[PDB]
């Protein structure tokens, strides 16, 4: 019934979706061709939230594949589960973005996008009840930032009441993937900040940390990271996909998660993340899970959340557990770690609980956090946009694509207005003073 549309933009976004669709397919026990013989009726009864039933007992995912190149698509079509996709949903260029937002958003994608919107329309009309529009992409490169903006723009116009969500990869604090990554990460956000209800800030440097430090991986690779990432995307939807003691969809989470209409840029995180070398020496309990939810180091984003305060948090637990054990553990952290939280949002927590655990675990917990500390991204990228823009580096690549530097100036100005709004709500008091003025007139009569 309540049916999400997925998009997968550029090389990065495509490969997160390519992992996503092995991973949720496995959770629903789906056969690599789009068949089924799996062990549970419950698994199949609900799948529709991410699938369509093709004739003679067959299953297709509500996925759109999006790229300005012939590259990465050819590998999804040869990989594990490459067969489930409707061949029609590959609508593709012969040009690339060139690491350039404006080539995505005002040239090569601008020439292609109406051919992709035509698949978005057809999947949105083939929905029962259209729920949302999720995107895997990046913000520091050219294609998923640039084409994905242009899609979001055109779809956010068409479907104003549906949720509009972005599982974004974002540039890391210390070493870079592409040199123009701060321009890309400003110009895409200069569209997304008033065209999304939800967006994520995924720091692959923290995934590389969590892959060595917690998960204890010897050679850690995209193979790993896109699992860790896609766990979080199937994990946030578990309270819509499946029954539990607290069902909760993405918008029911978002109303609790976003206080003011630009504070929607979230810190992700999962528990447990104990290695295969450590399983036998750790227990799998709500205390142990809630410990690793709020451990700084486990944070799949740019910073320790104690460079800020939590405006809001949401916990989406999975598997059979005492709601009382959960509620007590979420009450302990609010009262032992109260300095981590914004004080005029009285209690910062939304809780949800699915009966169904992920594969190979006793229980887990998906976590969405909103801390004012996410300015550690935006202080960097606005500065790093400025540092190159201030000497006018790389600029003719983008103004070759129908840009003027007034749009660059306007956008780094918007990012200052954003990081200043995020600071405006940082460290603000739960008390607001009265006056010392005096009533009537003052005599000893």
């Amino acid at each position: 019934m309540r049916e999400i549309v997925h998009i997968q933009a550029g090389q990065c976004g495509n490969q997160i979706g390519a992992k996503f669709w092995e991973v949720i397919s496995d959770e629903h026990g789906i056969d690599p061709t789009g068949s089924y013989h799996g062990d549970s009726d419950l698994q199949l009864e609900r799948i529709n939230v991410y699938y369509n039933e093709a004739a003679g007992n067959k299953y297709v995912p509500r996925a759109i594949l999006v790229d300005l190149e012939p590259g990465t698509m050819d590998s999804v079509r040869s990989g594990p589960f490459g067969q489930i996709f409707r061949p029609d949903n590959f609508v593709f260029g012969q040009s690339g973005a060139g690491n350039n937002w404006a080539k995505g958003h005002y040239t090569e994608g601008a020439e292609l996008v109406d051919s992709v919107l035509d698949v978005v329309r057809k999947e949105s009309e083939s929905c029962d009840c259209l729920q949302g529009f999720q995107l895997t992409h990046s913000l520091g490169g050219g294609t998923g930032s640039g084409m994905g903006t242009l899609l979001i723009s055109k779809i956010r116009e068409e479907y104003p009441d549906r949720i509009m969500n972005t599982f974004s990869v974002v540039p890391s604090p210390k070493v870079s993937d592409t040199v123009v990554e701060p321009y890309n990460a400003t110009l895409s956000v200069h569209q997304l900040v008033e065209n999304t209800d939800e967006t994520y800030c995924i720091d692959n440097e923290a995934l590389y940390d969590i892959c060595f430090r917690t998960l204890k991986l010897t050679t850690p690779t995209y193979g790993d990271l896109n699992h860790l990432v896609s766990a979080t995307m199937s994990g946030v939807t578990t309270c819509l996909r499946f029954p539990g003691q607290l069902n909760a969809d993405l918008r029911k989470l978002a109303v609790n998660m976003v206080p003011f209409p630009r504070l929607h840029f979230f810190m992700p995180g999962f528990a447990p993340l104990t290695s295969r070398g450590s399983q036998q020496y750790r227990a799998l309990t709500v205390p142990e899970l809630t410990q690793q939810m709020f451990d700084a180091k486990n944070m799949m984003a740019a910073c320790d959340p104690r460079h800020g305060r939590y405006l809001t948090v949401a916990a989406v637990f999975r598997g059979r557990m005492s709601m009382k054990e959960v509620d007590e553990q979420m009450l302990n952290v609010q009262n032992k770690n109260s300095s981590y939280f914004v004080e005029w949002i009285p209690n910062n927590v939304k809780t949800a609980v699915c009966d169904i655990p992920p594969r190979g675990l006793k229980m887990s917990a998906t976590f969405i956090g909103n801390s004012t500390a996410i300015q550690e991204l935006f202080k960097r990228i606005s500065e790093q946009f400025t540092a190159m823009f201030r000497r006018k580096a790389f600029l003719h690549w983008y103004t070759g694509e129908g840009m003027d530097e007034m749009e660059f100036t306007e956008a780094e100005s918007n990012m200052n207005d954003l990081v200043s709004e995020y600071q405006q709500y940082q460290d603000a008091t739960a008390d607001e003073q009265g006056e010392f003025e005096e009533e009537g007139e003052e005599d000893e009569a």
Binding site: L240, V255, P259, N347, K350
Partner: protein
């Protein structure tokens, strides 16, 4: 003869609904498809299961019920579970998309999609009742649909069924536990509607009911499933005299003064006794004195506020099973002696009493105390003031920063409408205070009456 109706709105409502209809089909020996496999009737007798079950067909009986959330999945589980055949499928309404913990969706933009459907099904339900007494309603009061739609339903019954008993049972938000962020706003937006319409409102609390379950009942890590099966013992007990014969009964038209000391204050607390494990009831035996004294203990109330911080105003005690009035009347005397209980000066005749013959029906596997003789207690106290005084401050904290206001505005409420609710909440604060005195003077208590 006569009928109650049963309404579950939003996911807590619904979930509690699998719990209370399970208990009602134990307590009457109804199997999961509506058959009464040990029926004995002469036909056309009493036989009061007909107050809660409509007889269908050959001897299918059918719960006098309706259910909704605007999310499918929660009503789909009733449609699929142990009792799927118990329900008539047109009871089980759903929406396209949850009310998203915004009251505004439940009362305007999503709720309008299901309301006159919802009411048409009830018209059909009440058209079949012989002497409808009223409506008893579980709802997610702090939720999306449990907040917005229950209160839209209340307003939309009250124009047609204004003479029926309109009774409801929330889940209330809790002094340190928190399941959602906007829980307080919806709590006020719904209190601000259903104060004009409801004839009583029975507040109960998860953070409270856990502690009783880990203390008394001695349940190590309670579930929401455990909880809904405990919460089920309040409505069970206040229906015992609509379901079995007794030495003293009530009807729905009784609780709406005997729990309502003055109309704005329609907000009692409740509990049920003894609430102990097997190992404890094996070990040690309780009497109807002890079990009346336990209902007045702070640690034993299904809401977190200490009765001592306030004062009592109105009380209903509902005895089930092997007990006699000569003991029961002296056990209330007890509660009349210990000045650790204080009632208000306006209420020297503060006890109302009922006595049903049927013992509580022992649960499956015998997982509860084997006590033939259990008691429900329900009371209106001034101590609830200290549970509202947190909630109305939690509004004042968020609304100063307009935090989350934009989703309410998003679905079509105006800042005028959250401000009007908040000023009746500072008025509710004033109505808890009009009894904060000894005074008799004629606008709070009458100068020409004597108690």
């Amino acid at each position: 003869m006569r009928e109650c109706i049963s309404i579950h709105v939003g996911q807590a409502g619904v979930q509690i609904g699998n719990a209370c209809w399970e208990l009602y089909c134990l307590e009457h020996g109804i199997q999961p498809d509506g058959q009464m496999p040990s029926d004995k009737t002469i036909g056309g007798g009493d036989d009061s299961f007909n107050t809660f079950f409509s007889e269908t067909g050959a001897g299918k009986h059918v719960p006098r019920a309706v259910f909704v959330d605007l999310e499918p999945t929660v009503i789909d589980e009733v449609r699929t579970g142990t009792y799927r055949q118990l329900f008539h499928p047109e009871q089980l309404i759903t929406g396209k998309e949850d009310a998203a913990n915004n009251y505004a969706r439940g009362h305007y933009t999503i709720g309008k999609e299901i309301i006159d459907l919802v009411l048409d099904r009830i018209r059909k339900l009440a058209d079949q009742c012989t002497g409808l007494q009223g409506f008893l309603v579980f709802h997610s009061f702090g939720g999306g649909t449990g907040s917005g739609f229950t209160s839209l339903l209340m307003e939309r019954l009250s124009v047609d069924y204004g003479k029926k008993s309109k009774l409801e049972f929330s889940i209330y938000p809790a002094p340190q536990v928190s399941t959602a962020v906007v829980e307080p706003y919806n709590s006020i937006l719904t209190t601000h509607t259903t104060l004009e319409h409801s004839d009583c409102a029975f507040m109960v609390d998860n953070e409270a009911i856990y502690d009783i379950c880990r203390r008394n009942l001695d349940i190590e890590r309670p579930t929401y499933t455990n909880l809904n099966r405990l919460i089920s013992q309040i409505v069970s007990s206040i229906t015992a005299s609509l379901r079995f014969d007794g030495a003293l009964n009530v009807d729905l038209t009784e609780f709406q003064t005997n729990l309502v000391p003055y109309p704005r204050i329609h907000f009692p607390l409740a509990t049920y006794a003894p609430v102990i494990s097997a190992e404890k009831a094996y070990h040690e035996q309780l009497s109807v004195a002890e079990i009346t004294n336990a209902c007045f203990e702070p640690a034993n109330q299904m809401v977190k506020c200490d009765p001592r911080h306030g004062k009592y105003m109105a009380c209903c005690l509902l005895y089930r099973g092997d007990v006699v009035p000569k003991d029961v009347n002296a056990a209330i005397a007890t509660i009349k002696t210990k000045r650790s209980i204080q009632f208000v000066d306006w209420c020297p005749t503060g006890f109302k009493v009922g006595i049903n013959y049927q013992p509580p029906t022992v649960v499956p596997g015998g997982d509860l105390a084997k006590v033939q003789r259990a008691v429900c207690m329900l009371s209106n106290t001034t101590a609830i003031a200290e549970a509202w005084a947190r909630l109305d401050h939690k509004f004042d904290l968020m609304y100063a920063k307009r935090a989350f206001v934009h989703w309410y505005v998003g679905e079509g409420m105006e800042e005028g409408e959250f401000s009007e609710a908040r000023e009746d909440m500072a008025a509710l604060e004033k109505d808890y205070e009009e009894v904060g005195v000894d005074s008799v003077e004629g606008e709070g208590e009458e100068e020409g009456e004597e108690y």
